[PDB]
Design a protein around this ligand. Structure first.
Ligand SMILES: [Zn+2]
Length: 98
Protein backbone atom coordinates (compact mmCIF):
# COMPACT_ATOMS: atom_id res chain seq x y z
CA UNK A 1 0.00 0.00 0.00
CA UNK A 2 1.14 3.53 -0.83
CA UNK A 3 0.13 6.72 0.95
CA UNK A 4 0.86 10.04 -0.75
CA UNK A 5 -0.63 13.15 0.82
CA UNK A 6 -4.39 12.60 0.88
CA UNK A 7 -4.15 9.73 -1.64
CA UNK A 8 -3.90 6.07 -0.63
CA UNK A 9 -3.39 3.23 -3.12
CA UNK A 10 -4.25 -0.30 -1.98
CA UNK A 11 -2.84 -2.76 -4.55
CA UNK A 12 -4.17 -5.90 -2.89
CA UNK A 13 -7.73 -4.55 -3.12
CA UNK A 14 -7.37 -2.53 -6.35
CA UNK A 15 -8.75 0.50 -4.52
CA UNK A 16 -7.59 4.10 -4.49
CA UNK A 17 -8.87 6.46 -1.84
CA UNK A 18 -8.82 10.24 -1.65
CA UNK A 19 -9.56 11.81 1.75
CA UNK A 20 -10.33 8.25 2.80
CA UNK A 21 -13.10 7.85 0.23
CA UNK A 22 -12.92 5.08 -2.39
CA UNK A 23 -12.51 6.52 -5.89
CA UNK A 24 -14.37 5.17 -8.91
CA UNK A 25 -11.50 4.34 -11.27
CA UNK A 26 -11.51 1.96 -14.21
CA UNK A 27 -9.12 -0.98 -13.99
CA UNK A 28 -6.88 0.83 -16.48
CA UNK A 29 -6.96 4.08 -14.51
CA UNK A 30 -6.00 2.21 -11.35
CA UNK A 31 -3.15 0.34 -13.06
CA UNK A 32 -1.81 3.63 -14.45
CA UNK A 33 -2.07 5.27 -11.05
CA UNK A 34 -0.39 2.33 -9.31
CA UNK A 35 2.32 1.99 -11.95
CA UNK A 36 3.20 5.66 -11.53
CA UNK A 37 3.20 5.45 -7.74
CA UNK A 38 5.24 2.22 -7.88
CA UNK A 39 8.21 3.97 -9.52
CA UNK A 40 8.04 6.54 -6.66
CA UNK A 41 8.96 9.91 -8.11
CA UNK A 42 10.87 8.58 -11.12
CA UNK A 43 9.83 9.81 -14.54
CA UNK A 44 8.09 7.20 -16.73
CA UNK A 45 7.80 7.66 -20.46
CA UNK A 46 4.47 7.33 -22.28
CA UNK A 47 5.88 4.43 -24.32
CA UNK A 48 6.83 2.66 -21.08
CA UNK A 49 3.34 3.16 -19.61
CA UNK A 50 1.82 1.80 -22.85
CA UNK A 51 3.94 -1.36 -22.84
CA UNK A 52 3.17 -2.17 -19.21
CA UNK A 53 -0.37 -0.89 -18.59
CA UNK A 54 -1.96 -1.37 -22.06
CA UNK A 55 0.39 -3.79 -23.82
CA UNK A 56 1.45 -4.81 -27.31
CA UNK A 57 -1.81 -3.90 -29.07
CA UNK A 58 -1.03 -0.29 -28.16
CA UNK A 59 2.55 0.20 -29.35
CA UNK A 60 2.45 3.48 -31.26
CA UNK A 61 -0.44 5.42 -29.72
CA UNK A 62 1.07 7.43 -26.87
CA UNK A 63 -1.95 9.78 -26.97
CA UNK A 64 -3.94 7.18 -25.03
CA UNK A 65 -1.64 7.81 -22.07
CA UNK A 66 -2.22 11.57 -22.11
CA UNK A 67 -5.99 11.09 -22.43
CA UNK A 68 -6.00 8.64 -19.50
CA UNK A 69 -3.78 10.87 -17.34
CA UNK A 70 -6.22 13.74 -17.89
CA UNK A 71 -9.16 11.55 -16.86
CA UNK A 72 -7.20 10.27 -13.84
CA UNK A 73 -6.30 13.84 -12.90
CA UNK A 74 -9.96 14.86 -13.00
CA UNK A 75 -10.70 12.03 -10.54
CA UNK A 76 -7.80 12.40 -8.06
CA UNK A 77 -6.52 16.01 -8.19
CA UNK A 78 -7.85 18.80 -6.00
CA UNK A 79 -7.18 21.13 -8.96
CA UNK A 80 -6.90 19.10 -12.19
CA UNK A 81 -5.48 22.03 -14.17
CA UNK A 82 -2.70 22.47 -11.60
CA UNK A 83 -1.96 18.88 -10.63
CA UNK A 84 0.01 17.91 -7.52
CA UNK A 85 -0.07 14.08 -7.53
CA UNK A 86 0.45 13.11 -11.17
CA UNK A 87 3.10 15.42 -12.57
CA UNK A 88 4.29 16.12 -16.10
CA UNK A 89 7.95 16.11 -17.10
CA UNK A 90 7.92 18.20 -20.27
CA UNK A 91 8.68 16.14 -23.34
CA UNK A 92 9.58 12.92 -21.54
CA UNK A 93 6.60 11.66 -19.52
CA UNK A 94 4.87 11.57 -16.14
CA UNK A 95 5.74 10.90 -12.52
CA UNK A 96 4.17 10.69 -9.07
CA UNK A 97 5.02 13.38 -6.54
CA UNK A 98 7.48 12.46 -3.79
ZN1 LIG B 1 7.28 0.43 -15.05
Amino acid sequence: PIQIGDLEIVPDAYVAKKYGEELDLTHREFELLYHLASHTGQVITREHLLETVWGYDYFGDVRTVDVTVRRLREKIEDTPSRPEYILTRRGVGYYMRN
